UniProtKB/Swiss-Prot annotation, chain C:
This is Negative elongation factor B. One of its GO terms (biological process) is negative regulation of transcription elongation by RNA polymerase II. It comes from the Eukaryota. Disulfide bonds: none annotated. GO terms for molecular function: RNA binding. It is found in: Nucleus. Essential component of the NELF complex, a complex that negatively regulates the elongation of transcription by RNA polymerase II. The NELF complex, which acts via an association with the DSIF complex and causes transcriptional pausing, is counteracted by the P-TEFb kinase complex. May be able to induce chromatin unfolding. Essential for early embryogenesis; plays an important role in maintaining the undifferentiated state of embryonic stem cells (ESCs) by preventing unscheduled expression of developmental genes. Belongs to the NELF-B family. The NELF complex is composed of NELFA, NELFB, NELFCD (isoform NELF-C or isoform NELF-D) and NELFE; the N-terminus of NELFB binds to the NELFA:NELFCD subcomplex. Binds RNA which may help to stabilize the NELF complex on nucleic acid. Interacts with the first BRCT repeat of BRCA1. Interacts with KIAA1191. Interacts with NELFE. The lineage of its organism: Eukaryota, Metazoa, Chordata, Craniata, Vertebrata. Keywords: Acetylation, Nucleus, Phosphoprotein, Repressor, RNA-binding, Transcription, Transcription regulation.
């Protein structure tokens, strides 16, 4: 009949992974957990036991580098290029077009990405490697129409 | 560094064995 | 993933737990934690949705940033340590140490902290003590840091060098008692350069680095252990150490150890197993160059000469000069080269007596050793030369010459009352054995039964003697040769001295097939473990057992 015990452990697994407290999916995962009647007390345990603070550890490395004389804007550019590298590797046109058909209006973050010139470069490099994708053609036109 | 100039008994015996061996090696050489 | 994060105002897992427990609005708490503890780069906030939309986890973004930035910072630390003016150099690295050190037990960050200390000539002593207190910090950090700890905690240094010494000494004993009996190679065969590649002396060289103070501590350890144990192998290691730093061009030590040039000269003679005339005269000059008031360097020159490898080369050289003084028909008194070897040899053999009660005077040279003892030694040579030629001559007639089997009483008196006479007589015995001169050997073996300091029963002489006795392995079929060596020599001392018990069994094992079986069984009975004996002769006595039952299948 009911899923409840399979779903529960599917969720307890994610709770165990590294720094799951940082993941955007954690809200969806917590709702699946409770709609499947999961007791909550051991969830706080899993999330805190497996917290490593990788992201805060990046902040530390950055300020250390800056204190030793690296220009701040350059640490920023390394960090941005890593986001940019991941986005180019995993770029799926069907996911991008889903941004559009999930709501006719565009999301607020698209018009915000466009204010930074490195993100506009990412969209241009994306518009070449995938010339017949709809979300990129829209975004390049949004930039141009600015 | 001080040594008496005269030879000891063991020294003179050595010099005698030296000469005994010279003779033997000459005799071996010819006959 | 650790406590040190709180030291820098950054929440960790316990902070998270206290935040979520009994929270009136947990999901709001989570979303705030997410923004307060992510990468604090405002330009990311608009683009992270784009990554979230593709299902790529934030962990993969954060981790890959972390790997690059960490490597770049490691590179930057090396760059800062080899750049610019000194105080700017180490100020930047000290500042970074004060920041990052509270994170030293996080696995992802410990390499940064380790690298920073690795490049800091003077890690601050507060930090050093905190490193020394924790076993896994201390053990997993660079030798540049350890040296700074050792420099100011001698007992910890000592606890590090004691197990290396122990291994060394055990290796030296295993080498003198390995059942690898050979005339081709023996204990004194490997070159100084080869021996200096061993793992103990290389580890000691690495621990010392260029730190004069650590080197003095190692010298001090070797002196103390040499004094307490009389084990001459500690002298070899003191030589090997200084010579290792010589080959590594470590001038910070070599230019300030007054024994350096001496040891370097002596090391070339050891490599040739001979002191030629030039290096002899240079050794003489270092000896004569001992300035008044610094007479205790004599003690240290002695120790380096007490190196068994040095002793072996001096004794070999002495026996060679006798041999070629016979050809030149010259007396020992008339050979200045010979007196010089004797001077060096006497110092080496006296080293421990010197260090014991600090009387730093060269030993008195006994006139009679040059005028009486060495002359009797050369007589045995001339005798043996005369016997050889007596055979190549015809008409032996009555009395085909009998090999002289007589020892002048004064000879054995020198052997039993004088360190140096005993030593060179021992090496003259080693020579005739190597020549498999069965006649000379049987003439001299009696009167090795009682020697100064039981020197004829030392491990070094017995290792070489038994090694050379393989060249004569066939002679062990005859039982009066067999009993001349066992009943006449080895069994003289095997009940009282354990190592002689051990050597005797080790020679038998190597020679078991050649020995007449009824004599084998008798010797076996005479070499039984005496109940108060140690594990080494018990295992050796067992090895005899299996070899003597395996030989019975022929």
């Amino acid at each position: 009949g009911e899923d409840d015990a399979e779903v529960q452990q599917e969720c307890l697994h994610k709770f165990s992974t590294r720094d799951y407290i940082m993941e955007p999916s954690i809200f969806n995962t917590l709702k699946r957990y409770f709609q499947a009647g999961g007791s909550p007390e051991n969830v706080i345990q899993l999330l805190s036991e497996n917290y490593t603070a990788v992201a805060q550890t990046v902040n530390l490395l950055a300020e250390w580098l800056i204190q030793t004389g690296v220009e701040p804007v350059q640490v920023q550019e390394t960090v941005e290029n890593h986001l940019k590298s991941l986005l180019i590797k995993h770029f799926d046109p069907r996911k991008a077009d889903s941004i559009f058909t999930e709501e006719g209006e565009t999301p607020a973050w698209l018009e915000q990405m466009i204010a930074h010139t490195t993100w506009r470069d990412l969209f241009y490099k994306l518009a070449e490697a995938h010339p017949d994708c709809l979300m990129l053609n829209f975004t390049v036109k949004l930039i141009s129409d600015a | 560094l001080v040594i008496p100039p005269g030879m000891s008994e063991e020294e003179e015996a050595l010099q005698k064995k030296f000469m005994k061996l010279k003779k033997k090696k000459k005799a071996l050489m010819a006959l | 993933m650790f406590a040190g994060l709180q030291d820098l105002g950054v929440a960790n897992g316990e902070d998270l737990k206290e935040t979520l427990t009994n929270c009136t609005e947990p999901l709001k708490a989570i979303e705030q934690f997410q923004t307060e503890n992510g990468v604090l780069l405002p330009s990311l906030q608009s683009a992270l949705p784009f990554l979230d939309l593709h299902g790529t986890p934030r962990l993969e973004f954060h981790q890959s940033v972390f790997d690059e930035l960490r490597d770049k910072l490691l590179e930057r630390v090396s760059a800062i340590a080899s750049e610019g003016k000194a105080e700017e150099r180490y100020k930047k690295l000290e500042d970074l140490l004060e920041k990052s050190f509270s994170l030293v037990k996080m696995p992802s960050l410990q390499p940064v902290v380790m690298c920073v200390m690795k490049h800091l000539p003077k890690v601050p002593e507060k930090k050093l003590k905190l490193v020394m207190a924790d076993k896994e910090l201390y053990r997993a950090c660079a030798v540049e840091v350890k040296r700074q700890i050792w420099q100011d905690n001698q007992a910890l240094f000592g606890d590090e060098v004691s197990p290396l010494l122990k291994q060394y000494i055990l290796e030296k004993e295993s080498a003198l008692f390995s059942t690898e009996l050979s005339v081709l190679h023996n204990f004194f065969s490997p070159s100084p350069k080869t021996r200096r590649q061993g793992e103990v002396v290389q580890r000691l060289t690495r621990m010392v680095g260029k730190n004069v103070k650590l080197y003095d501590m190692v010298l001090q350890f070797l002196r103390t252990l040499f004094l307490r144990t009389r084990n001459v192998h500690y002298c070899t290691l003191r030589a090997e150490l200084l010579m290792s730093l010589h080959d590594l061009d470590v001038g910070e030590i070599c230019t300030v150890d007054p024994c350096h040039k001496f040891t370097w000269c002596l090391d070339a003679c050891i490599r040739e197993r001979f002191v030629d005339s030039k290096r002899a005269r240079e050794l003489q000059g270092f000896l004569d160059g001992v300035k008044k008031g610094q007479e205790q360097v004599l003690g240290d020159l002695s120790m380096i000469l007490c190196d068994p490898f040095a002793i072996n080369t001096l004794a070999l050289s002495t026996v060679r000069h006798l041999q070629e003084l016979v050809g030149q028909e010259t007396l020992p008194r008339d050979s200045p080269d010979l007196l010089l070897l004797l001077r060096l040899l006497a110092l080496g053999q006296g080293a421990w007596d010197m260090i014991d009660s600090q009387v730093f005077k060269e030993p008195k040279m006994e006139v009679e050793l040059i005028t009486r003892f060495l002359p009797m030694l050369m007589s045995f040579l001339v005798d043996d030369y005369t016997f050889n030629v007596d055979q190549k001559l015809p008409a032996e007639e009555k009395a085909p010459v009998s090999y002289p089997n007589t020892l002048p009483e004064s000879f054995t008196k020198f052997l039993q009352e004088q360190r140096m006479a005993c030593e060179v007589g021992l090496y003259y015995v080693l020579h005739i054995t190597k020549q498999r001169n069965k006649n000379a050997l049987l003439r001299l073996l009696p009167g090795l039964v009682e020697t100064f300091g039981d020197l004829a029963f030392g491990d070094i002489f017995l290792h070489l003697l038994t090694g050379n006795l393989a060249l004569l392995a066939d002679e062990f079929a005859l039982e009066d040769f067999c009993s001349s060596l066992f009943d006449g020599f080895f069994l003289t001392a095997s009940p009282r001295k354990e190592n002689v018990h051990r050597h005797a069994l080790r020679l038998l094992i190597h020679l078991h097939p050649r020995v007449a079986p009824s004599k084998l069984e008798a010797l076996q009975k005479a070499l039984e473990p005496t109940g108060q004996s140690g594990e080494a002769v018990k295992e050796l006595y067992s090895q005899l057992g299996e070899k003597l039952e395996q030989l019975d299948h022929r």
